[PDB]
Design a protein around this nucleic acid. Structure first.
Ligand SMILES: C[S@@+](CC[C@H](N)C(=O)[O-])C[C@H]1O[C@@H](n2cnc3c(N)ncnc32)[C@H](O)[C@@H]1O
Ligand SMILES: C[S@@+](CC[C@H](N)C(=O)[O-])C[C@H]1O[C@@H](n2cnc3c(N)ncnc32)[C@H](O)[C@@H]1O
Ligand SMILES: [Zn+2]
Ligand SMILES: [Zn+2]
Ligand SMILES: [Zn+2]
Ligand SMILES: [Zn+2]
Ligand SMILES: [Zn+2]
Ligand SMILES: [Zn+2]
Lengths: 82, 103, 222, 110, 97, 100, 86, 222, 109, 95
DNA sequence: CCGGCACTGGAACAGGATGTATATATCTGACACGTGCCTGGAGACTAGGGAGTAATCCCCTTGGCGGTTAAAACGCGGGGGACAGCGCGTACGTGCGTTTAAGCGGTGCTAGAGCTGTCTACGACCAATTGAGCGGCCTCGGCACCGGGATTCTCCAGGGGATCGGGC
DNA sequence: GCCCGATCCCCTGGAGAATCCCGGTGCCGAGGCCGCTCAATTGGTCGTAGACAGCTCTAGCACCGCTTAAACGCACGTACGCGCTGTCCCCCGCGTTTTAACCGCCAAGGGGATTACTCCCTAGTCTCCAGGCACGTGTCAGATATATACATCCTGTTCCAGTGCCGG
């Protein structure tokens, strides 16, 4: 089945926790709709490159090195996942 | 026939300064794993159909998303304080992203 | 009917009656302050203790300032003066001798760890045999303090709509307690009082019959 | 082979493998030829830059009453030194966390 | 069972270096991955910078004199002054035997 | 002899914003800029000579840096509801960028 | 020896010069303390490029700084520049 | 003594006498606005014209509105009413027929292009033989407009400490010119007048004999 | 050599040198072997990318009533197109200038 | 003395005369077009290199070149260049 | 009162004041065109290995079910923070005159960049021998919980001893 | 007058306490050995990359004089920061009820990863011949710049047309 409406599984308390780890003390009421649009354009740029790296090798399974290469390409190195 | 006494409430700003100290010291993940994993499979369907994912390749995306959001919420705060406020509004995110170079 | 109140059992700590007892905390969850070994008041009163402002309580094994700190008051029991004096308007009450600078506290409110259903049982008992219990205080869901059998000078207390004492909750060693603090500066030799807001499912008994500007009010409105 | 063999890490006094750095240089498409002191110079820098991090990570793990290093101590070690933090500016360590820091204007005053 | 093929890493030299600075601490299986990534990441920056230094000048060899310049271009101020001493002492001790 | 009314504040500035955004020349003096390069470069090596077009290459990078820092400085001021720039907007711009 | 040393040449970046650079960026009104800070911001930027250019120059065993050393030292920090060769 | 003054040679443009001439610029250094072909007012008065706001004048060969724009007023000379009439308090003055809303202008100030030294010599002659010539206007360094011998219906104007006009300078075709305007809305049939800030190198002649709240003043006090 | 020599960029129908792109690939330390269609693929892309930055610069120069092209028209052509502005994002063009832009809060009311 | 210096001047000048038959160009602008061509060549080659390395190969082929263009060029530029390349590669072999 | 005669002006003439186009004075610097040659690209073979294609094995990704408890959703009060309006005063902008270096042409000079020729020491290549490093199977053993008597201390327990209203 | 029988402040037989501390017990994740196979060291041979010495000639540095545009003080008026006060609304802290994430099992099969075999695509050599680069001849880019009769518009003037006054 085709998926839909999964952007609403990022609840409101899950965003307040990230704001508290970032260090903010008081939050407005329009930030929750503003953040689900910034999170959704960061993931597309990474998944596009991961799927390109995957098709070039004739596989049908996204591995954990495709993501690391697609991240390093944009200057976001990540240590710890081989 | 008999009342039960209640103490005084907390002042606004105390239970929000306790959570800053609690969360700036742990290392756990702050999003639910099944809700996050459905979103990736919904997005990746408009590029190539019917493909599979490794359980450790889905865990590498969740470590980068949170490291991105937590570090954007630290630039938003300095703009809110520049404008002589304590609350963060939707017009600080845009100034931060525009000066930083994305939008 | 002319001397000290009817006999009570004098105790200092709280015991458990129900099922859940104290949550004994290890020395790895206790928060920590940023104070340095410095002049006469470390973790004092006029200073900015990151624990004292968030209503915590230091433990001498983690605090950098060691044992010179003055944030150990729920565990040392340096209770003030002001023993019992009978009251003319209400039953006994209390009275003080000396003055107290605003910002310091009086004896802790201690009792027994009664629970919800047994508290229900007790209030129905007091109705069907004419006791009308008046010693209850909520600390947490299904965690209640009762000062009927146990207690100290604190249980001999009354109400006011313009008091000088406040009841705030502190977290010591991973456990939530309750200590009464003084609202304003008080000259020597008067009656202290603290305000409490009742929460009952029965009927309204009476009005706060003191003498002041807002003293009238009522019991269960404001 | 006639004499008794001796690895090249023992001639210079190192712990990292000179003979493997040499092959990684030779089969990596960097140039047409490779000298004789380039691996011996590169290993002696790769080892210093590692001792430098492990010392601070062990110091940081000692001040918590622990006898083992985990990914949090590698984070605290690097984000406190102003030159390792410049060498590793755009890098993300998995399960590291952040540094405790609250702004002064937000604290509750009387 | 098949006895899957072999894979090499630096996890037995990192462990020899640790026991000379702190003779009684350990390290976790998830903290060793980060150190592999560190070493593999720092090897490539230096090699890639020396490769361009040798081509700007129309040479076709990589010697111990391009490595020294790449270390200076890459490392910060007070870090780049101890690494040069380490390397130039190792090379001298090597070429004497 | 009588004089006409003088200009109002904010016209002779809003009129040259419009003519410095239309030309492409260089906006500093060549000899004062060159004497400073030859002075900075004395802390690294003595007796250095400079080609004639290695100094015309640094001036353009420098001006392209400053002209673009001022455009980021001008948005923080408007954020704070001012129209003047102060020495505390440069610091915010640089810190958010990731330099200081 | 023709060794005329220099000093106090950071004051040749005058006040009108800075005002013109601020007008090209779109600025209407300027405070009075920007002038003693733009100079400190420029002196920091010039050092990180001249150091790398002199490093590229000493490697080739030369004495003249050419116009390719500057282009390499600039491109090495993500500030590519078209027009001067390459 | 009571009618139209002695004859004065009429000139429409500005002629040159000294050494500096006009600056005929080409169609390569004239600023150009950003308006769009639109309703009744393109580059008009109630529009947001970047050339009108900064006191520029559009050329019909650059302005995108072709010949529909209203920003060409110095080269067309559609002057309003109020020609020469006679005044009793002062020499001649003027009076209009139709009420002019705020935002329109009055005839341009024309004359001769004498220089500094020539103004010096002329004022000195007129002083040593008691003529007291008072028709001068400084527009630039070593550039002065003289309306003594020639001019138009403008040079017959006066001072007023409570004025309704203004002398503000415009740049047309790379050359600076002066033109009178209207401060605010005024009725019809009254005397338009304008303030000028005199700058005297010698003595102050007279006091402004206008009648109003603050028109006592003087000629050159501020 | 018996037949009539015919270049490699006339078979493909191009204007750029295939035989020179080949040698630049082979003597640049990119890999150990280079196929036969790689230069023919790369030359077409290098030509398509350059044959469209000039088709905007000519249009921008004709809107000034001019004949030649100068470094200012290239700047105007590049900063006014939303794909070239993302490709050439951190590049500085010598003698280019800036784009005419003025905020809306600084104009007089 | 003065051996030589290679550039793309005589090919840029050939391409210009197909889009604008009556238009010139100056030296300061030719020296920018040269830098542009040289800058893009070495971004496109230095990534096919890394692809062939990641996949344990030894040859750079037209498939590597085609994949390394979809990662660099954004949007419609890639969609048009990928079509321009496989026309030349088809016309070349059938001859 | 009619004619003579002196008196007078709107308007154009002569010579001139002055506004627009046209025939030389002479420089003028940079993009677009010819021509020889010298090096680099094209044609025609041969030789060895890198990549393509087909089978075989087993690991790991996907899917379904049941139970328990922690987290998300919803509705209330209330006090604190964002925002608008005034008022005062300091500091930046516009204009004018005097003082100071930047820019533009020369003239003389030598330091060092760039190219050519010879020649010795250094890195690729190949065959033979042996030990350093990776995978799988095992211990040992210091960590979190249960006892567990019983420990320095306090506490419920009613008990003894100084102290009286009448008792004697 | 002395004291009887009860009477409330000191006093300690077990108790109870949590738990200072002194032992079992079940624990996964770091440490440890014993084969074993393939990648690093030893020993010669060969040919090209790079070091070193000369020599020619460009171009970077220094000095001198002249003209003029840009930098520097100084005065004055006003528009813009910055602080203060009052209102109201929207975000935080608390209780109840509802929903779906987690954890532990079981089951079926798709596709990732080796291993053997064979063929065609690329490197390496010799010939050979024309494309691209440096230098030299040529036509404007038509700019900018002065003189020069005289193109229509402003004006001192001299005989000419109306006009009023003196006279016969
Ligand atoms: C908390 S108990 C403690 C005092 C003691 N039980 C007594 O009153 O004799 C006090 C009781 O007296 C009542 N009370 C005390 N002060 C009062 C007052 N000022 N007004 C009304 N009721 C009061 C309360 O309702 C409560 O039940
Ligand atoms: C500029 S002329 C205007 C008319 C001209 N004088 C005429 O008679 O035709 C006016 C002269 O009178 C003086 N004046 C005009 N209006 C004045 C006034 N309102 N108060 C004082 N003097 C005034 C001026 O000094 C000026 O010299
Ligand atoms: Zn503290
Ligand atoms: Zn403390
Ligand atoms: Zn009361
Ligand atoms: Zn117009
Ligand atoms: Zn307009
Ligand atoms: Zn007046």
């Amino acid at each position: 089945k085709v998926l839909r409406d999964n952007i609403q599984g990022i609840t409101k308390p899950a965003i307040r926790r990230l704001a508290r780890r970032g260090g903010v003390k008081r939050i407005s009421g329009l930030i929750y709709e503003e953040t689900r649009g910034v999170l959704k354009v960061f993931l597309e740029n990474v998944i596009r490159d991961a799927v390109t790296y995957t098709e070039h090798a004739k596989r049908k399974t996204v591995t954990a090195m495709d993501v690391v290469y697609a991240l390093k390409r944009q200057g976001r190195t990540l240590y710890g996942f081989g | 026939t008999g009342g039960v006494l209640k103490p005084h409430r907390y002042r606004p700003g105390t239970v929000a300064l306790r959570e800053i100290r609690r969360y700036q010291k742990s290392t756990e993940l702050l999003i639910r794993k099944l809700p996050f994993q459905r979103l990736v499979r919904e997005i990746a369907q408009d590029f190539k159909t019917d493909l599979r994912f490794q359980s450790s390749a889905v865990l590498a995306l969740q470590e980068a998303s949170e490291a991105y959001l937590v570090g954007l919420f630290e630039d938003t705060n300095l703009c809110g304080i520049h404008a002589k406020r304590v609350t963060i509004l939707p017009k600080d995110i845009q100034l931060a992203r525009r000066i930083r170079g994305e939008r | 009917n002319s001397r000290k109140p009817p006999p009570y059992k004098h105790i200092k700590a709280n015991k458990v009656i129900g099922k859940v007892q104290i949550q004994v905390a290890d020395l790895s969850e206790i928060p920590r302050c940023n104070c340095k070994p410095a002049d006469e008041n470390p973790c004092g009163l006029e200073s900015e203790c990151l624990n004292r402002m968030l209503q915590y309580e230091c433990h001498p094994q983690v605090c950098p300032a060691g044992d010179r700190c003055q944030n150990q008051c729920f565990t040392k029991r340096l209770y003030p003066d002001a023993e019992i004096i009978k009251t003319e308007r209400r039953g006994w009450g209390l009275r003080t001798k000396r003055s107290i600078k605003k910002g310091e506290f009086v004896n802790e409110y201690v009792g027994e760890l009664i629970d919800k259903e047994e508290c229900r049982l007790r209030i129905k008992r007091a109705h069907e045999n004419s006791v009308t219990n008046f010693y209850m205080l909520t600390v947490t869901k299904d965690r209640i303090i009762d000062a009927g059998p146990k207690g100290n000078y604190s249980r001999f207390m009354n109400h006011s709509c313009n008091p000088n004492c406040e009841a705030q909750k502190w977290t010591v060693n991973g456990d939530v307690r309750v200590g009464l603090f003084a609202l304003c500066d008080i000259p020597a030799g008067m009656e202290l009082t603290f305000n409490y807001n009742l929460d009952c499912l029965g009927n309204g008994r009476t009005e706060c019959h003191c003498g002041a500007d807002n003293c009238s009010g009522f019991l269960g409105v404001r | 082979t006639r004499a008794k063999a001796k690895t090249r890490s023992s001639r210079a006094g190192l712990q990292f493998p000179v003979g493997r750095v040499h092959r990684l240089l030779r089969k990596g498409n960097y140039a047409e030829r490779v000298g004789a002191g380039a691996p011996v110079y590169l290993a002696a820098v790769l080892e210093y830059l590692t001792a430098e991090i492990l010392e601070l990570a062990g110091n940081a793990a000692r001040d918590n009453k622990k006898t083992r290093i985990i990914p949090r101590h590698l984070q605290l070690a690097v984000r406190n030194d102003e030159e390792l933090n410049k060498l590793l500016g755009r890098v993300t360590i998995a399960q590291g966390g952040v540094l405790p820091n609250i702004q002064s204007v937000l604290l509750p005053k009387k | 069972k098949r006895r899957k093929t072999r894979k090499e890493s630096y996890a037995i030299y990192v462990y020899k270096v640790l026991k000379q600075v702190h003779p009684d601490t350990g390290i976790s299986s998830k903290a060793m991955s980060i150190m592999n990534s560190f070493v593999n990441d720092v090897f490539e920056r230096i090699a890639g910078e020396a490769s361009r230094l040798a081509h700007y000048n129309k040479r076709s060899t990589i010697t111990s004199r391009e490595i020294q310049t790449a270390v200076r271009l890459l490392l910060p101020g007070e870090l780049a002054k101890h690494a040069v001493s380490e390397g130039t002492k190792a090379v001298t001790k090597y070429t004497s035997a």
